[PDB]
Structure 1
Amino acid sequence: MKRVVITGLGIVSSIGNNQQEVLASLREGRSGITFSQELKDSGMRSHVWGNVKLDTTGLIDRKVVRFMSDASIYAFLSMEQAIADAGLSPEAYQNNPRVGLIAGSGGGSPRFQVFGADAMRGPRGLKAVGPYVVTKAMASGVSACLATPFKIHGVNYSISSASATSAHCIGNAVEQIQLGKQDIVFAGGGEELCWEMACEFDAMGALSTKYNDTPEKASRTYDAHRDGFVIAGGGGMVVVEELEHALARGAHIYAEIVGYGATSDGADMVAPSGEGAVRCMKMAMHGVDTPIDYLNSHGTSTPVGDVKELAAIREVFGDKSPAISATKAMTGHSLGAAGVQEAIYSLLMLEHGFIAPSINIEELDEQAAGLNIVTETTDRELTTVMSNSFGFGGTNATLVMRKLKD
């Protein structure tokens, strides 16, 4: 029954360590992809990634960071930013039963799980493993490592759904507020970047391997010669809040979440059916009586995936399709963190009135003909935006956000 808005955001990504840096990159169509000596040394074929350009050493208290893996660290930093951006003080959100946290990652921590196994097999056994691997490697690490130090008393758990992970976290947060159980819920996620995890993707042939010499051109959603996505890492968090509660404290409102769709393909384990995406987008548009001005597609730069989504978009919008752009062309695929980060990019476009470009399209794919895929930064007042997130196992999520009247 309650209305839900976003009143704060935080982000650590391949194209910026805060929203100011991210805004700059989006407007310039700047790539965050670099060559990775780590991936190459591991024996992989894909040697490019969207890495976080930031030394996190000493940014978090020793007694707090000892339980964390990179996914949790990225999410933590993003939350600190979100709290400051939202203008919330400790006395308001801490030890408050009406304030919760829903954040997750797609793979937990392959790095620390492998570390533990490797240590256990050495001559020092248990002594070499140490007592902190469980909180670093458990699937709920991102929520557990944040809810505790931030003194959260409300809901506390992680939602995981591969590449749709953080989108579902935001959606579930919305639901908690609509149910009247929470007034504020920090929602987002994080994902570490390491060969331990990346090699499994390369092994299934999902990663780009043809552009290692020109890193910034590897991620090329919609380009006729795309050859897989570029793995990335990072984190993001947004403050989901009940409308009256936000207005009562004089919060800055970025937008209202007016639609949330969550569906399942029930078809293929790794490829989207398209049919599920159609139902997801429609579900998210139910009751939304303003046109979608911009759509931030899932578009990972894969042969099948890119066009399956475009086909879904055509069926949903008919001859009234919105401006479209795939920011992954610039940032790479941050997996579990993709949902929240892309929701954030969309919010920035909505807040500053511009559409970020879909870069690296040298030869548009035949199946993309006729659609308005923006390839250059465009100034334009936007009112309603949509963001898609699809994951392995046929899990779909769509979020629709709209400016609040006045």
Structure 2
Amino acid sequence: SRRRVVITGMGMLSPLGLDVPSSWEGILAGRSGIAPIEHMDLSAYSTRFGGSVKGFNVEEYLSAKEARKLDLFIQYGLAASFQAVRDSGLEVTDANRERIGVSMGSGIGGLTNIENNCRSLFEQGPRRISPFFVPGSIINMVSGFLSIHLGLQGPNYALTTAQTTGTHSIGMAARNIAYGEADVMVAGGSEMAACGLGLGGFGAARALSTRNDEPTRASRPWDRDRDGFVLSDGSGALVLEELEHARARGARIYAELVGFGMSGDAFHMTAPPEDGAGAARCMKNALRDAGLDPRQVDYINAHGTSTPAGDIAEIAAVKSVFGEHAHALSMSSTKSMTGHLLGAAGAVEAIFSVLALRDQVAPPTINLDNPDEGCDLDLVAHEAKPRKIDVALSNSFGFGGTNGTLVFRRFA
């Protein structure tokens, strides 16, 4: 029968820091992690900035000879995963290794590596493709390499649900534990899509902000002057653990994962419906799953991408689900500061939602200078808001009409 699931460990690389505390300090201070991209020449591109991980040292985690064969999305995913496992205090033994698994996802995975090998193929030939091309690039290898390094023999898989990946990964991992398929899961996501194909591809779709001359002000969810999302890199990982398992070993419990919702829009390959009907169905599924009155919700970490259609669909969904309570909860987009980490967005934002619960503070939506028509909720404009938070919701929506909602609450 269905078991309870708590969060005992968290790990992060973000545009705001190389761990969780440094990232959360930036969040509460309203700091932007967005800047012109330094790692490649983008003069031919319509967008030349994003949220890079700054000063990442993979040799804090892995030998250079290994790191050299792994795409950055794997390196980031492993770094966050190692942080989360160390943060949990869990010791992997012969007695528990079959009961610990991993579900770390990505939207696009090792596009940098694939692009670089495609260049070798076209300019030189197939004789110059890296022997590590497949295991160093494909999405399931965060889960794979983490299991090899820590000895995890439980369920080993990866989700790829575009911008919903991190949320689905955590929710599905929580169901594994709930249903008895595992006692512990490391779950979240990682992304590094800032290569020519990624920036060029999102650029060709005209999905990105082109605020090149003022990158820190580009991501402005629900602001009338928003012009699309800001591409960002990094990783979030959480250690999810069955409650009695956590209690038995005296684990520090950050919060309880009480609800998970999924739904499909069945509307459009890339556009969200204006009424946010799929997002509403998803949140209602999650609140029913959590056994909650919707009035219990204190804080929503929105998807809040800074796209024209996405931001207004989320206001419409929150008003539909919460009615008059929509005006009492606080909702913010931390993508205002981090930008959009794509398949990692739901992972870092689950962590921010747990820290909102730990610290009793709603992170700000920076850059919300002029809220757009209908954007008249408490969106925590500009400055962090200390407040009572017993229940926090994290929402994600993605290409394919794919929706995910996580519901966290304080654990006594």
Q: What's the TM-score once normalised by structure 1's chain length?
A: 0.95
Aligned to 1:34: 35
CA distance in 1 between counterparts of 2:127 and 2:30 reads: 48
Is the counterpart of residue 373 in structure 1 residue 375 in structure 2?
Answer: no
Q: CA deviation at 1:40?
A: 5.5
Q: Is the contact made by 2:58 and 2:79 (CA closer than 8 Å) also made in structure 1?
A: no
Deviations 1:194-227 (A, max 9, x none): 2331210011010001x21111101000100000
Q: Is the contact made by 2:36 and 2:48 (CA closer than 8 Å) also made in structure 1?
A: yes
CA distance in 1 between counterparts of 2:388 and 2:196 reads: 41
Q: Is the contact made by 1:258 and 1:288 (CA closer than 8 Å) also made in structure 2?
A: no
2:75 corresponds to which of 53, 73, 76: 73
Q: CA deviation at 1:232?
A: 0.3
Q: CA deviation at 1:128?
A: 1.9
Matched ranges for 1:165-180 at <5 A: 165-180=165-180
Aligned to 2:347: 340
CA distance in 1 between counterparts of 2:347 and 2:73 reads: 13
Deviations 1:44-79 (A, max 9, x none): 111210010123253312454344211111111111
Note the residue ranges of structure 2 that are not aligned, 5 or more in a row.
none
Matched ranges for 1:305-320 at <5 A: 305-320=310-325
Aligned to 2:292: 288
Matched ranges for 1:4-403 at <5 A: 4-37=5-38, 41=42, 43-59=44-60, 60-91=62-93, 96-123=97-124, 125-192=125-192, 193-209=194-210, 211-273=211-273, 274-286=276-288, 287-289=291-293, 291-321=296-326, 322-369=329-376, 371-375=377-381, 376-403=383-410
CA distance in 1 between counterparts of 2:23 and 2:13 reads: 9
Alignment length, in residue pairs?
401
- Aligned AA (1:33): I
Q: Is the contact made by 1:71 and 1:234 (CA closer than 8 Å) also made in structure 2?
A: yes
Q: CA deviation at 1:141?
A: 2.7
Instruction: Return closer, same or farther for 1:81/1:92 CA change in 2, 3 Å cut-off.
Output: farther
Q: CA deviation at 1:380?
A: 1.9
Q: Is the contact made by 1:64 and 1:149 (CA closer than 8 Å) also made in structure 2?
A: no
- Aligned AA (2:77): A
Q: Secondary structure at the match of 1:134?
A: coil
Q: Secondary structure at the match of 2:134?
A: helix
- Aligned AA (2:323): G
Q: Is the contact made by 1:385 and 1:402 (CA closer than 8 Å) also made in structure 2?
A: yes
Q: Secondary structure at the match of 1:159?
A: coil
* Greater displacement, 388-397 / 68-77: 68-77
- Aligned AA (2:300): L
RMSD: 1.6
Q: Is the contact made by 1:68 and 1:141 (CA closer than 8 Å) also made in structure 2?
A: no
CA distance in 2 between counterparts of 1:48 and 1:103 reads: 26
Q: Is the contact made by 2:58 and 2:75 (CA closer than 8 Å) also made in structure 1?
A: no
Q: CA deviation at 1:91?
A: 2.9
CA distance in 1 between counterparts of 2:388 and 2:152 reads: 37
Q: CA deviation at 1:115?
A: 1.6
CA distance in 1 between counterparts of 2:38 and 2:51 reads: 13
* Greater displacement, 261-270 / 38-47: 38-47
CA distance in 2 between counterparts of 1:108 and 1:79 reads: 16
Q: Is the contact made by 2:34 and 2:52 (CA closer than 8 Å) also made in structure 1?
A: yes
Q: Secondary structure at the match of 1:318?
A: helix
Q: Is the contact made by 2:105 and 2:189 (CA closer than 8 Å) also made in structure 1?
A: yes
Q: Secondary structure at the match of 2:103?
A: strand
Q: CA deviation at 1:92?
A: 7.1
Q: Secondary structure at the match of 2:136?
A: helix
Q: CA deviation at 1:90?
A: 3.6
Q: Secondary structure at the match of 1:168?
A: helix
Q: Is the contact made by 1:37 and 1:47 (CA closer than 8 Å) also made in structure 2?
A: no
CA distance in 1 between counterparts of 2:406 and 2:58 reads: 34
Instruction: Return closer, same or farther for 1:42/1:147 CA change in 2, 3 Å cut-off.
Output: farther
CA distance in 1 between counterparts of 2:48 and 2:267 reads: 31
CA distance in 1 between counterparts of 2:354 and 2:265 reads: 28
Deviations 1:246-279 (A, max 9, x none): 0000001111111100110111010112111111
Deviations 1:101-136 (A, max 9, x none): 01111001111112222212333x344212111112
CA distance in 2 between counterparts of 1:152 and 1:90 reads: 8
Q: Is the contact made by 1:167 and 1:340 (CA closer than 8 Å) also made in structure 2?
A: yes
- Aligned AA (1:337): A
Q: CA deviation at 1:37?
A: 4.6
Q: Is the contact made by 1:34 and 1:215 (CA closer than 8 Å) also made in structure 2?
A: yes
Note the residue ranges of structure 1 that are not aligned, 5 or more in a row.
none
Deviations 1:137-170 (A, max 9, x none): 2232322222222221011110110000011010
CA distance in 1 between counterparts of 2:16 and 2:40 reads: 20
Q: Is the contact made by 2:58 and 2:67 (CA closer than 8 Å) also made in structure 1?
A: no
